[PDB]
């Protein structure tokens, strides 16, 4: 399903197909969303992802 969601979204927009599975998708701004929670700080995981 998830990939069918990704494909379905990218097919009705000019968005490129992401390599890994994102977590959400905003319709107003048309942006794939990858959420990142962690016990560490923030810059570490941010620049890791």
């Amino acid at each position: 399903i998830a990939w069918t969601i990704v494909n379905s979204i990218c097919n009705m927009t000019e968005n490129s197909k992401p390599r890994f599975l994102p977590d959400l998708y905003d319709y107003k701004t048309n942006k794939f969303i990858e959420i990142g929670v962690t016990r560490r700080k923030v810059e570490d995981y941010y620049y890791e992802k």
Partner: protein
């Protein structure tokens, strides 16, 4: 003057006129009754060959299991199954020696295979013995039943969706002593009409003991093989059960990956390549020799091939091949040899009796041969009934030693090959040496040396070395001559000649449908012109005769004929209605377009430009109700038998002539009447699932989740995006329905 066609051989060499020694234009032999007499004959002979072996009662079964391996060495030319483990391992080791890292990659490929193999792969293939119903069933059902039973009991690892997890359950199922299975039986109700009896099927839960389930799992069904040519007497063939299938698949998959990389292996390649391998070995054997040396070829058949091949040895093989690999992989493959070592065989329908005086007949189940008076039978039979009773257990009969046709494959050939691989100069280091090609019981062997006695030494050495691993060359059916002429109905005479008669039965109407038969028919002619020297003139006549058979069989005679069938009128309407006649298909009363140059071009394609646009619009109307949408993997496929059984692909355009005939209806009367409804329901669920996943018909959807959940999840996003970027009242209506359903459990 009396005419004698064999006198042709005075002038013409036998190979060049071999077509006359093949009577393949008449109906082949068919068994009328039962194969109990043949099954018992096999089971008896099997033990009789291993008689000197060690008997032991099985702990879990109580079966009188005979063991001939590592038994006494034989001392006569009679068939014998007293192989030697160390002698096998020596050959298997030598085979490893001669092919650096073959076993490595062979196993490695099997590892990736095992890991990646879904359970779905087991729905493919020949029919299997369904221990659930005690009858043979298509793999797809025989499996589905076993899974349902496993599910109803405490087994559901297969739910994962990978063969090895299902394959795990089978070993665990041997533990549960009380296995719960549902039976079906015929009850009779009473109905009133505005009063008559009524028939109806009811279900009855039963539980089986360890003793039973273990036997049923080790049970291998038996039948008489029909339509078998070349032989006066019928033979018994066997069908494996659902348990051992999964393992045999991987053992065979390993043995295949082995055989694929051996010159001396005839399997699994086709005739053209077999002949290429036979050419290669001859070229090599002649190039490797000196001018002052002899070369003899022996046309070879191994007598009682399966009866004298032992599962214990197969265990030794599979172990030695896997040497150095992960022990879970080592164990996984070792299963099938063990299950075979402890295999028990069903004895078919049984027998039928007849009273001359009273004019009556009666049937008796094979299970009843334990408790039965022997006054009914004749000598040969009742003697066999005697000999079998010592082995008989729980209806079935124990069969530890030997094998039976239609059980197992490939690995047996690896045995034969290793004996050929033994014959290298660099291994034997004698005044003689040998090489050849082998597939199952059939083998061709080239023996080289300096003298005729030198050759004799090689023959005997090869012959006895074969016996030491339970391979018996047929001294009656095998023979030898100087290298030049000699394999599986291929005939080499300083080069392979043609054997067209072998293929004659394939020249006819295959009986799939109007569409498929036309493509198969023309292709048959085509492939024989290429491979078996079917000449132009005869090939043209072959076209003519096929068209005649095709037209008569399907009642599709040409629109301008004066014949009278059930179709002639409707075909006549079409013929008059039609403007461009040449465009009409033979199935629609049109002319035959085919000749030597056309044979490779589908009829609809070949006649496309000549069709009335309406006609072809109707003919190829994708909305027609006659076709039923298959799956990509099963589209344009048919079944053919040369070998045991094989799929034949054909080229054709999907038209209204691409239909399937009615199904058999006998089951309506039987207790399994409900399977039809099961099928009817099961299909209807996939019919709608495909509406949510059209992709499913091309590639099988890998997924572990409720069928309904998958449909709903998509049903949402389809409905949403069809609006978002593509009315909200329809969207709300769809989401309301999606939720409304989802509420219901």
């Amino acid at each position: 003057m009396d005419v004698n066609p064999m006198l042709i051989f005075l002038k013409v060499p036998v190979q060049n006129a071999i077509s006359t020694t093949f009577p393949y234009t008449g109906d082949p032999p068919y068994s009328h009754g039962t194969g109990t007499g043949y099954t018992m004959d096999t089971v008896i002979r099997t033990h009789d060959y291993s008689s000197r072996g060690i008997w032991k009662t099985n702990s879990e079964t109580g079966a009188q299991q005979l063991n001939p391996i590592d038994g006494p060495l034989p001392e006569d030319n009679e068939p014998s199954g007293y192989a030697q483990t160390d002698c096998v391992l020596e050959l298997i080791e030598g085979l490893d020696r001669s092919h650096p890292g073959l076993f490595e990659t062979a196993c490695q490929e099997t590892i990736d295979a095992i890991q990646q193999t879904r359970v779905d792969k087991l729905t493919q293939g020949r029919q299997t013995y369904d221990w659930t119903l005690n009858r043979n069933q298509p793999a797809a059902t025989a499996l589905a039943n076993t899974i349902e039973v496993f599910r109803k009991n405490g087994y559901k690892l297969n739910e994962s969706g990978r063969l090895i997890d299902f394959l795990k359950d089978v070993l665990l199922s041997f533990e549960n002593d009380s296995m719960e299975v549902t039976t079906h039986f015929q009850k009779k109700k009473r109905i009133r009409d505005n009063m008559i009896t009524q028939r109806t099927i009811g279900k009855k839960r039963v539980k089986l003991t360890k003793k039973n389930y273990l036997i049923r799992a080790l049970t291998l069904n038996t039948m008489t093989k029909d339509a078998e040519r070349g032989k006066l007497k019928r033979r018994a063939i066997a069908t494996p059960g659902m348990q051992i299938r999964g393992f045999v698949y991987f053992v065979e998959l390993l043995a295949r990956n082995i055989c694929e990389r051996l010159e001396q292996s005839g399997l699994p390649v086709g005739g053209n390549e077999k002949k290429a391998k036979l050419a290669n070995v001859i070229k090599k054997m002649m190039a490797k020799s000196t001018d002052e040396e002899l070369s003899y070829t022996i046309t070879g058949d191994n007598t009682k091939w399966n009866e004298n091949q032992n599962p214990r040895i197969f265990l030794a093989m599979v172990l030695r091949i896997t040497a150095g690999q992960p022990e879970w992989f080592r164990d996984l493959l070792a299963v099938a040899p063990i299950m075979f070592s402890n295999k028990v065989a069903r004895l078919g329908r049984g027998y039928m009796f007849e009273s001359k005086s009273m004019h009556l007949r009666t049937q008796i189940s094979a299970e009843n041969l334990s408790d039965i008076n022997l006054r009914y039978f004749n000598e040969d039979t009742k003697k066999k009934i005697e000999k079998i009773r010592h082995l008989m257990v729980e209806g079935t009969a124990s069969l530890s030693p030997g094998m039976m046709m239609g059980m197992f494959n490939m690995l047996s050939t690896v045995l034969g090959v290793s004996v050929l691989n033994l014959g290298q100069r660099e291994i034997l280091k004698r005044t003689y040496w040998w090489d050849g090609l082998q597939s199952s019981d059939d083998f061709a062997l080239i023996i080289n040396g300096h003298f005729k006695e030198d050759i004799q030494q090689g023959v005997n050495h090869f012959y006895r070395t074969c016996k030491l691993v339970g391979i018996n060359m047929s001294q009656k059916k095998s023979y030898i001559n100087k290298t030049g002429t000699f394999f599986t109905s291929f005939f080499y005479r300083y080069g392979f000649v043609a054997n067209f008669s072998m293929e004659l039965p394939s020249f006819g109407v295959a009986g799939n449908n109007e569409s498929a038969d036309m493509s198969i028919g023309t292709t048959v002619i085509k492939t024989n012109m290429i491979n078996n020297d079917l000449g132009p003139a005869t090939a043209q006549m072959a076209i003519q005769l096929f068209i005649k058979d095709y037209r008569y069989t399907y009642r599709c005679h040409r629109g301008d004929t004066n014949l009278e069938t059930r179709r002639t009128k409707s075909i006549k309407r079409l013929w008059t209605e039609t403007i461009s006649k040449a465009g009409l298909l033979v199935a629609d009363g049109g002319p035959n377009p085919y000749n030597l140059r056309n044979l490779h071009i589908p009829e609809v394609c070949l006649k496309w430009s000549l069709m009335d646009p309406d006609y072809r619009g109707r003919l190829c109307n994708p909305n027609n109700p006659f076709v039923h949408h298959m799956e990509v993997e099963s589209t344009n496929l048919a079944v053919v038998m040369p070998g045991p059984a094989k799929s034949l692909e054909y080229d054709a355009v999907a038209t209204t002539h691409s239909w399937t005939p009615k199904r058999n209806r006998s089951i309506l009367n039987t207790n399994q009447r409900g399977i039809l409804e099961d099928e009817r329901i099961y299909q209807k669920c996939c019919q709608v699932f495909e509406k949510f996943f059209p992709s499913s018909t091309y590639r099988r959807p890998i997924g572990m989740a409720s069928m309904l959940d998958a449909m709903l999840s998509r049903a949402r996003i389809d409905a949403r995006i069809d609006l978002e970027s593509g009315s909200s009242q329809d969207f709300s209506e769809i989401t309301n329905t999606c939720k409304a359903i989802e509420a219901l459990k």
